[PDB]
Model the fold of this input.
Amino acid sequence: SGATGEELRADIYVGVVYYQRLRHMKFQVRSTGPVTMQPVKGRKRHGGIRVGEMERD
DNA sequence: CTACCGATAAGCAGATCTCTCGATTGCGTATGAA
Done:
């Protein structure tokens, strides 16, 4: 282990494998700004998030 | 004889979560100053 420094209980299964990186890299936040006087739609437009009917339920 | 309405095959309106990007915006034809 790297914190205690003691040996682990069992031998770890370690090896080399081929690993690929994907392109799915998203976060949005608003307080005021663009706006039926309701806030605009769109992440890139500084919009909000719609509270759907199921959310109201 | 017959007015009214309850047994019988068929026409109209309506239906089926949230988010990010990208792309795109039918096709046609006439008047009048020179």
